[model samples]
Target: MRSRPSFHPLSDELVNYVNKRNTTWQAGHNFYNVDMSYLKRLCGTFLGGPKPPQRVMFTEDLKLPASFDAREQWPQCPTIKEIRDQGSCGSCWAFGAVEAISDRICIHTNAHVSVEVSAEDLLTCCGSMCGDGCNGGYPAEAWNFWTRKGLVSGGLYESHVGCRPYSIPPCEHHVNGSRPPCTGEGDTPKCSKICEPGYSPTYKQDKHYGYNSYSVSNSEKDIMAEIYKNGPVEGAFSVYSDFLLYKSGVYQHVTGEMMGGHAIRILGWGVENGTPYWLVANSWNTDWGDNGFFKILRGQDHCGIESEVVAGIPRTD
Candidate 1:
C-alpha cells in the first residue's frame, strides 16, 4: 500500500496561500510534504451528532482570570505537557480523552495521583461501544467507558513503565525529523484483561475509574468555568487544511478546505494581541504546532471547538 497522499497537501503553495492572506496564524512546512489523505487519517474524531454536557452555573463570586494556563496552575501534572502521538491511526479521540483524564486526576487529587489512562486499552477495548477502533471514535463514549468499565495505566511506547505502554512507537512525522517512517495505519492493539509482563499489579488493580464524566455546554462562560474548577477537557474541531500548515499565533481557519474533525485537549485560554484564543494540546507530537500545542480563535466557537468539549471528575476510590 502507498503511504503517501495522492497530492502534496502540505506544500509551499499552501503555505504562501495561507501566509499571503490576513489571518490569525502563520504557515510553514510543519509536517513537510504530506498528502491530504495522511492528514485526513489523523483527523479521526468521527463526524457525528452532538453530545450534551452537564449544565454549569456561573457564580458571581467566581472571578475569571484574564489568562489561564493549566500547566502553570498545576505544574505537578506533567501530562499537561502534551506528549501524545496518534501514530498512523485516527486515535485522536482516545488520546484526547485519556490526556484530559490523566491531567484531571492529578489536578483533582491536588497533585496526588498523576496517571495516564491508556489509549491502547481505551481504543482497542472500548470496541463498538466507544467507536470503530483505530478508524475513528466518539469522545463521549470514551469517557462513559472510563466511568463504567474503567481504564488501565499506560505510558509512551517502549517505556514499559506502565501496565500497558503504548505499543506503536512514534514514527517520523515530517521530512526533517530523524525518527523511523510510519508504516501506514497501525493495527489497533487487541483488548486485554491482563497487564504487561512483570507488572506486579493485575490489570484490574491498575485500573482507574472516573465519576460524573460529562460534556460541557458549548458556551465560553460555561466552558471556562468548568476548566477553571477542574482541569483540561477534550475538544474536537473541524480541521481545515490551513490548520496543518500552522506555525504560530492564535489560529483562525483560513485558505484551505475543511479536512476532517480532530480531537485535542483545551488547557486554557488567553487574549493574544487583542484576539482571544483557546490554548489546545494536539496529539501530533511536539514537532507540530507550537510544541504540540496551538491557540484557536475562542468565544465565537470557531471551527466547532467549543461544541464538542468533554470533561469528568476523577475518583480516588
Candidate 2:
C-alpha cells in the first residue's frame, strides 16, 4: 500500500490542507469541492455510488451513563496530549495509531494512566517499506512496537479537568517506529497547526488489548461497537484534500479521491431521516465540520470506513 501523503511540517498552507481534506485527495481538487453534480460525475470509480458499508448499527443511550473517577477514566477523550497539527506534521499515521493505543491501555486497566508513546518511533523504526520514513506507517506496525516496548506512563494534566493548564511535552520516546517528532517547539508546539486559537487541551487515552488480523467483516462498525459497549473508542479516519471544504451538515460520498490520513474516534454511528451517518469526533476545531463532530454517509467507503483494519480493546470472539 502507498504511504500517506506529506504536508510540509510547520506550514500554515500544510495546515489548511490537513484541515480541509479527509484521507484522500491530498494533492489537489476532488469531485466534492468543485461546483458540480456529485452524482453525475465519476459514476463508477472512486467517486461513484457509495461503497458498501462493512457494518451498520442502530444505537441509543438510554441513561445518564455511569461515571469513572478522574484517573479511573483512563486515556479519555479531550485527552491532554500536545502534538503537531496534521496540517503541518502530516503525522496522522502516528496520531492514528498512538491515539488507539493510548486509549486501549486505559480501557483495559479501567483507570487512566499518563502513557504517551512517541510518533517518531513509528516513522523510523517501521522501516521504509511502511512508507516514506518521514511520512507514514501502518497502525498494525505501531501496535507491534507498543507491545514490544511496553508503553510508558504519560503524566497528569497538572490541573483539573477542563482547566487544561499543562504544556505540550516534547516527543519523549524518539525511539524508531514510534512517531514522527513535533518540530514546533515551546509555547507554540502546544497548539495544533490547524486548530482554532484559545483551544483547551484534552488528550484522548484508553486501553484495550491489541490483536492481529488479516480480514474481518465490517471491521469499522464491529470494532467501534465493541469499544462503545465499553466506552468511547479512538478510531482512525483517512483524511485528504476533499475534506478541506466539507461544511455541510450532511456528508455525501465524493467519487474519485485517494484515501488520505487516518484518524479514529467513534462518537456514534446511526441513521437519521433514512440517511446513514457515522457520528464521529474530529481533532480539527469545531469550525471545520458539524461542530467538531460529523455524520458521514454510511456505505460510501469514504475513509475506507469499512475496509481499514480494526484491532483494539475487548478483543475476543
Candidate 3:
C-alpha cells in the first residue's frame, strides 16, 4: 500500500530534450517511473572527508597511447572484465576500492592472484574510519583500511566465491522485467567475524593486504598513464539528475542539479565522436547503462572526477 510508479523528474521530457540537442551522449528510460528520492540516494561518496588519500605522482617514462583499457591490457584477469552491483546500499565507496584493488592484484601478480578483495569487509568492518556504511563513506579511507588492516575474500551477493560473500541481494535499480525494483535504502550490513558455513579459510586467513594507497593529481595525461601502467583506479564523481537518464557515449553535464557524490571505478579511456572520455564501471547492476559501464567526458575533470583518483599495489607474496 504505497505510491505507484509514475512520472518523476528523470523521464521522457529530460531524455527527449537531451537527445534533441544531439550531444555526444543520449538519455533513456533507465530512471523512468522511479522515485526521485530513491534515485538521489543511489550515490553515496563523501568528498574531502576525514583521512583522504595522500597525493602521488606517476611520472613513469612511456608513450601515452591515444586510448587504453585495463581489461584489454590484462585480459587474463577476469576480475577486470567483471561488473558488480552495490544492491540497494549506497556503499559505492567500498565497491570502488575493493573492485580496483581486486583488479590491481590480478594485474600485478600476472593474473590468478585471487578474485575478490571483499567489499563487505571494507564497507562495514572499517567501523567509523570509513564514514557511514550504507549512508555514505570515503573511498580513500576504504584503501586505508586495506593497508593497515587486511581485507577478506568476498564476491557478489551470496556468490559463495569467498569466505564472507556479500549479504545484500541485488535489486533492479532501473525498470527491468527481471529482478525486483529497488525501493528504500538497503540495511547497512553489520560486520561479522565468522565466515559462511563450511567455508575453507577463517576470516583472518583469507585476509588480503595491499601497499599504501595514494591519490593522483588532476592532470589527465598522468591519470592515463596511471591506469596504463598500474591497473584500474577508484574514482568519485558528482552525480546529477540528468545522469540517471544516460544511455551511452561520452557524458557531459548538460543540465540537472547535483544529486551527490558517487564512487566508481575508472578502468580505461577512449575518444567517441571527437569527445575524449573515461570508461567507468558503476556499482549498479549490469542491467543499467551500458551493462554497468558508462563513459564520462575526460580531460576536463568533469564532476571533480580527476581530482580524487585512488589506488595501490596488491601484496601477492
Candidate 4:
C-alpha cells in the first residue's frame, strides 16, 4: 500500500538519499529513467498539491501535430549529444539549462554554434542564487544568470565529477569547446545501462535533474527575448494524483496516484485540436509519454503548466 505523503519536509532518509544520489555516486542508467513516485515525493509537496499525477495525461489542449511526427516525439526540447552517464551529482539542471540555451541561440540568432555550457560553473559559481554548490536551484534563476554572465563553452574538455567539479577528467568527453568556470580534470564516467541517450534533444532522448515552474503574464516575444539572451528555463508542475507508476504505454492520469514531481523541458509551444500546448520533454523512456514528448494542457491548466508560463518561463516558437 502507498504511504502518507510528506506534507512538511522530506524525511532525513529521503533528503539524505537524494542529496547523496545527487552528489556522490553516478546515477547509472536506471537513474536516468527513474520511478515517477520518487520524483513526486521529492518535490511535489511544494507544488501546492497532495501529489503529482501518477498516470500520463496528454489532454486535447496539449495536442501535438500527429503521432510519429518528427517534431512530435520525445526529446522535443534540445540537449547535448550523448557521451556517457553523469551518474548522480544533480548536474542535470546544468545540462538541461545549457541545452535549451544553446538551442535558443541557434534558433534565434542562427549562430549554428553547438556550444556546451558548464554545469559546474553554474553549480559552483551560481550557487544559492541559482543552486547551492551542492544542493540545487531553480531553472529560472539559471536562465537569469546566463543573461548577465554569458556562459562560455564547457566543451567536452571538462571533468565528470560526483560532488566536486574537478574530480574527473577535463575535456575528457571530446566536447566542441570548453566553457569557463568548469576548469578541472579527471576520468570520464563510462556509459551506463540507461536508455536515455543524452543525444541532442532534437535527435533522440534526454533527461534532467530538477525543474521549477512559474506562471507567465507577458508577451511571448519578451519572454523569448529574455531566454534567448540568457538560457533555458526549468519549471515545476502540479497535477492530480496517480502519476507514480510509469510502467508503459500512453499515460492515463489515475484518480489519486500522485507520481513524479521531477523537472523537465518546455522546448516549444504550439496548438493542437484548437488548444495551446507546451512541448515538454520527458526523461521517461519513449514508451511513456507520446514518444518521450507530451503536450501539457495549457489553456485548461491540467498540470499547472499554464501557471508556469504565466509566472515567467515561456517556451520558444
RMSD values, in order shown: 2.7, 12.8, 3.3, 14.3
TM-score, each model? 0.93, 0.50, 0.92, 0.46
TM-score: the better of candidates 1 and 3: 1
Sequence-dependent TM-score of model 4? 0.46
Off by over 4 Å in 1: 1-7, 33-35, 50-52, 176-184
Question: Scored by Cα lDDT, where does model 2 land?
Answer: 0.39
lDDT of 1 by residue, 1-317 (tens): 86445644566788898888868888887775444556876888875444745646454688989999999988889888856887777888989999999899888877766877788889888978778777788888888889888889897778786788778766566664344444446567788777899876889899888886677887898888888888889888999887888889999988687778888899999999999999998888888888888999999989998988888887764
After superposition, which runs of candidate 2 have C-alpha atoms over 4 Å from their true positions? 1-84, 111-116, 120-125, 153-216, 219-221, 230-240, 255-263, 283-287, 314-317
lDDT by residue for model 4 (142-205), tens: 5555654545434332343222222223221111223322221122233231222233332112
Model 2 lDDT per residue over 1-317, tens place? 95343322223354355446553212221221221211111111111121222333344442322222212333363342322223223334445555555555555545444344434344334443334432334544444544443222232223222222223332321123245442322212232212122433423222223443122245444544444544444344555434544554446545325434454445456555666656555533344454445566665665666555334442432
lDDT of 4 at 304: 53
Model 4: weakest 10-residue lDDT segment is 23-32
Cα miss at 69, model 3 (Å)? Answer: 1.1
Which of 2 and 3 is ahead in lDDT? 3
TM-score of 2: 0.50
Question: What Cα-based lDDT does every candidate model obtain?
Answer: 0.81, 0.39, 0.81, 0.37
Quote the positional error of residue 30 for candidate 4 in Å: 9.4
Among all windows of 10 consecutive residues in model 2, the one with the lowest summed lDDT is 39-48
Once all C-alphas are superposed, what RMSD does model 2 give against the true structure? Answer: 12.8
Candidate 1: worst 10 consecutive residues by lDDT? 176-185
